[PDB]
Design a protein around this ligand. Structure first.
Ligand code: P1E
Length: 265
């Protein structure tokens, strides 16, 4: 059985790398008991002296302990004594949206397709574990290296806060139905975000008006330079009827073909 509780004396806290919902997040080192020292992200919790806040903070770490996939951020462990910390693997290049925005004129198309392919393998793995992510968006993706992205936020995930309406499948908005097919819809939006270099979907459109546009058959437009076969795949993720959406295993196979076709120019 994997380690869950880890010793604070084995963590060296480094620089602050941003803010989380419960408190600041720092970069650091985990001095692994039998392996080399690992670079980690240490999530801190400001009010975790309250066991009620501690329970909410640790809920995501409980979910993460069940996963082991190369394109899903790894939980290293937690420290339940005050101050409560969640120790994740560090993805050195940070948040996907910022990374793509900064490199909009330098990242080749094959890298953007590779990120979408890697994410489809992580979502097929989640489906195989009976989890619905419910929050698939570029903001929840992290960059380990130029050729490796990882799904890193599991706050809304469920073993089967403001709603991300602009990413949600119509049956999720209308009936609170969350399935692997509704994750496919969200993944289509996340692929659109990657191909748009981190631009958000439906900018300047009110959340309450998104519903109407989707219901009327309106969809996110073809990103400039997106291969037509890839945009067609995105539109299939946005079929109104969830039964007409592709499955994650089909998305993975089709993205592999699209990636291969781009690498051969
Ligand atoms: C390059 N920019 S940076 O600010 O230096 C940086 C910014 C993050 C990172 N890696 C990194 N690796 C892992 C995690 C996580 F904790 F596992 F999620 C992480 N989380 C981010 C840090 C606080 C905000 C949160 N995001 C996802 C909202 N971050 C490495 C460097």
């Amino acid at each position: 059985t994997r380690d869950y509780e880890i010793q604070r004396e084995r963590i060296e806290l480094g620089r602050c790398i941003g803010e989380g919902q419960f408190g600041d997040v720092h970069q650091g080192i985990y001095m692994s008991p039998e392996n080399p020292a690992l670079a980690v992200a240490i999530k801190t919790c400001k009010n975790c002296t309250s066991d009620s806040v501690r329970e909410k903070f640790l809920q995501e770490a409980l979910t993460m302990r069940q996963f082991d996939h190369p394109h899903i951020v790894k939980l290293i462990g937690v420290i339940t004594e005050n101050p409560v910390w969640i120790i994740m693997e560090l993805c050195t290049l940070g948040e996907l949206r910022s990374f793509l925005q900064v490199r909009k004129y330098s990242l080749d198309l094959a890298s953007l397709i590779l990120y979408a392919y890697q994410l489809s393998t992580a979502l097929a793995y989640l489906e195989s574990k009976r989890f619905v992510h419910r929050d698939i968006a570029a903001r929840n993706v992290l960059v380990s290296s130029n050729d490796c992205v990882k799904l890193g936020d599991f706050g809304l995930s469920r073993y089967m806060g403001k709603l991300p309406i602009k990413w949600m499948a119509p049956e999720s908005i209308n009936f609170r139905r969350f399935t692997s097919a509704s994750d496919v819809w969200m993944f289509g939006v996340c692929m659109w975000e990657i191909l748009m270099h981190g631009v958000k979907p439906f900018q300047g459109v009110k959340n309450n008006d998104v519903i109407g546009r989707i219901e009327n058959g309106e969809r996110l437009p073809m990103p400039p330079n997106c291969p037509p076969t890839l945009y067609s795949l995105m539109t299939k993720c946005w079929a109104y009827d969830p039964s007409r959406r592709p499955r994650f295993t089909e998305l993975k196979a089709q993205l592999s073909t699209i990636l291969e076709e781009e690498k051969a120019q």
